Amino acid sequence: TILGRLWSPSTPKELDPSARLRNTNGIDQLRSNLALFIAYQDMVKQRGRAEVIFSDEELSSTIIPWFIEAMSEVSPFKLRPINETTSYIGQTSAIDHMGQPS
Amino acid sequence: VAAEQGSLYLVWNVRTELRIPVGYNAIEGGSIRTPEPLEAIAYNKPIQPSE
């Protein structure tokens, strides 16, 4: 949610990732994978969409990402390039001379 | 809605296939971007895989 709070708009709470942002400089990667996002939604349903960016674990400075799997490699989760994330799939289609398909 | 947001969520920018009807999800006059989803994945030229 913190991060949530970064994708924004527009959440100028702190004026968005901010003062807390300034502790950071590791932030950088987190985001950068799609996979990463994916959890969020889970919260949305789950937590009904929780509240207050989890209290930031109260600023836990720079240390809890560093408990992640990318910083505590527990699961297969494979940083994998998007393109190759799969590809056994090709597309195929109809058309009536449409030329679109249907 | 509450909590207060509804997923910053995604869209794509297809325009690939031209003047096409497929649900209220568009048309997008001339130009096409488009938000949601399956169809867009329809909206390419078909292919083989590679995996």
Place this chain on the structure above:
Amino acid sequence: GFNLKVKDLNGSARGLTQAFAIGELKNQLSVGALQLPLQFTRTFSASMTSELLWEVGKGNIDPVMYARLFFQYAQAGGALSVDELVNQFTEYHQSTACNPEIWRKLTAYITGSSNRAIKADAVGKVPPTAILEQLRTLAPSEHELFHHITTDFVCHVLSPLGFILPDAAYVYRVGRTATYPNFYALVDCVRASDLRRMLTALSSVDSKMLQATFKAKGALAPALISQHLANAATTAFERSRGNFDANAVVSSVLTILGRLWSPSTPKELDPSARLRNTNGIDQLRSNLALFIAYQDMVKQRGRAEVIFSDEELSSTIIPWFIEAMSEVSPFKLRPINETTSYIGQTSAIDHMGQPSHVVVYEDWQFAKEITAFTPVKLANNSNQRFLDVEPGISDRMSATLAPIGNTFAVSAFVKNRTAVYEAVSQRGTVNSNGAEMTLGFPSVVERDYALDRDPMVAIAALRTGIVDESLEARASNDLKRSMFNYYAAVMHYAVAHNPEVVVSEHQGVAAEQGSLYLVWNVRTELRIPVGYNAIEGGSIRTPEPLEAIAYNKPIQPSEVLQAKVLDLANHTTSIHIWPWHEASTEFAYEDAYSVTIRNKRYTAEVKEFELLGLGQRRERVRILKPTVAHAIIQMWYSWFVEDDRTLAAARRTSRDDAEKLAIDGRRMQNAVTLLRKIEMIGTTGIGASAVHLAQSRIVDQMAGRGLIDDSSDLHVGINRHRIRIWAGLAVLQMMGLLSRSEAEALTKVLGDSNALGMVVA
């Protein structure tokens, strides 16, 4: 931009007259007894600007500022006899002089408890801040604090170091003042010279010495400081002590000088040669600034003269005003000429040759950056605070602003005014007799918007050409002053070109109404009736100006007198504004942005923040003003309006075909230009995105509705600009620039051509 018919001002802007300049009801304006050449050709004049910030944080003489505040007060009518106040003050000071035993005493505690008082101790003196106000208490409480300054004057001294600790500042920020001046203004400067001098002396300082002033020692020391204080005071006082004496008197000198000027005066109402000859006060006669200056005052005064020195005046006070010693009077020698240069003028003039419409124009810059600021408080329940500011937009917008800036010259105005022209078997000047003049001074008005008051009255002030109170006297004078300037350049300027430089006194409704002017010449040009004519052998002459300007021919300016406009406190860090709230506006904004195409209305609003990028609208975040441009905008705006109008009629009346036929196209052209202005600014990202937001949205509603995949088609341009244009218009709203009202109605009058240039087919 008062448009005026030659052969009347005495109605036309009734009281905006030389006559008025006498007061002079609507009599005279004549010729020609005696006549009397003088062309004093220099003035003492000033320069642009007098606004500033002036945060006080480490007061240390430098009058000016102060004085300026003084003026702000002086002006404020909460001071006026400011001077007087200084007396009061003098006395105040004096009373300072008188309570040493207190003062000291006070001091004595302030730091710090007295009688051994010695040594390197630890004397963490302070922000002294409050203390003072005790001292005020012990003092009396004359206006604001002078009092405090003075403190600072010792503070810093009192410190070698340590002996005052750290402090903050405030804000005050002088506003602007004149360009020309009057009398009262003069005397004070002189007095100011004292005052500054008073303070001049006042820093001075006594150093650190011994193992005392050096290494803190002596209760008896600072008992000596207090003495120092005294020393200061005294001295300060002393340098003060004789000097003050002459104010009305000065006027009188003027009156002498005047009475020199007078030249038909009684024999034993001469200034004897001993006078006449002496020092360069005589030079002083032959020094404009004044000349023009006196008279008026005297107009008020009806006359009166002190009678005094002939030997200190001559002329010692006289070059006590070596006037320019204050630059406060930035009435400082000018080769007269060197002004004007914000005047260009250009005119529309008929065939015979004979004239039409003369524009004197005012020449500007308008570059600007914004100033959109955090309005919070800091100080609750008390407003002198600093608040804050940030960019975000400010830059973005400004960045956009700049471009707009690009487009707009005064030059371009005039060009446009050129564009006005055309004429034909039309139109005068000789045909029907009254001739136009307009002088671009929206500027005045700007200030008025800055002064938040109704223009129309101003118009009235012209209109009647006199005072039209009803409402804030302050404002009124303010206006008045403007008007002074209004008179003020002009004839200099005219004269600058026109060294038709003589006098016959006009001697009002009789005889003793010493008002000097010259008629001016108009040399060639065979025949005109234009003016309450003379025509003095085809070489009309008048001490009434406008025409003369008419017998210029388009002069140029020679600077746009840039336009540096004050700004934020940047180093703002404590400090506190003073009138601000007025001076700030919230950016709310109402209105929208919608289109119905097909039959289907596509619809949106304004939703300011998001146009502005981030969230989220609220009462706060206020914005400093956008003044200049309003003045400008409307100009552009205003023009068209006439033109269609006037045109339309002419278009009507068309006694022949051709002409009618003729006029339009040109009228068409400009529109496109308009258009050109707008789309051009419509391109700007921050715009465009806005469009963006729109489109999507437009679409969104649309999406249910829309069904047909009709293709290319609206590659037919439209949209791009269409929207862009429109978008530009938003700019106008979201920086309220032009009202909702007018522009859409202008729009209204537009409606075509647009397919111009273009693909087609």
Place this chain on the structure above:
Amino acid sequence: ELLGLGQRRERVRILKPTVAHAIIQMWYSWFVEDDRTLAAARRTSRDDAEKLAIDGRRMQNAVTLLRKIEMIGTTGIGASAVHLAQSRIVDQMAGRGLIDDSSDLHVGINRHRIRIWAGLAVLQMMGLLSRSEAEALTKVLGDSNALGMVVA
């Protein structure tokens, strides 16, 4: 968490502050009597000069105390409070409604207030004081009541 660390084992006993708690209680105490005397000294002052002497003598130095205290806010640990602090607040208005408020941190008064308090707070987990005893320092609040203009 004030350390910045949720919320470890919970099982630390700490070498205690034998020295300073006392030294401070000297300091402390030293201060504390003095005001009595000083007030008294003013009372027994029955002319201005003396009272006046008291003034500053009374004043400045306190804020100096403060000088210490904010100063000791300029530390990591002060900051830990502070950061933690505002933020939590921030949400409380913003998160709940009105967001019109950062400023509210940013006038001295409060600022300092929290800062101080916090600063004192530290001491309290440094044992030292008593909340009670701080409270008398809070009795310093009535006085002068000048206080906290400007900073930093």
Place this chain on the structure above:
Amino acid sequence: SDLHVGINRHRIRIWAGLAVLQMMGLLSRSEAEALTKVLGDSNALGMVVA
């Protein structure tokens, strides 16, 4: 100067062209003037303006 404002030149020229149409009867009198009729603008096109 004024009718250095173009007009005439073309105006007439145009018109003149029309003569051609008559004097080699090309188009009848009727139609073309009525076409003319439906015309009536733009003409200030391109041009000096201003």
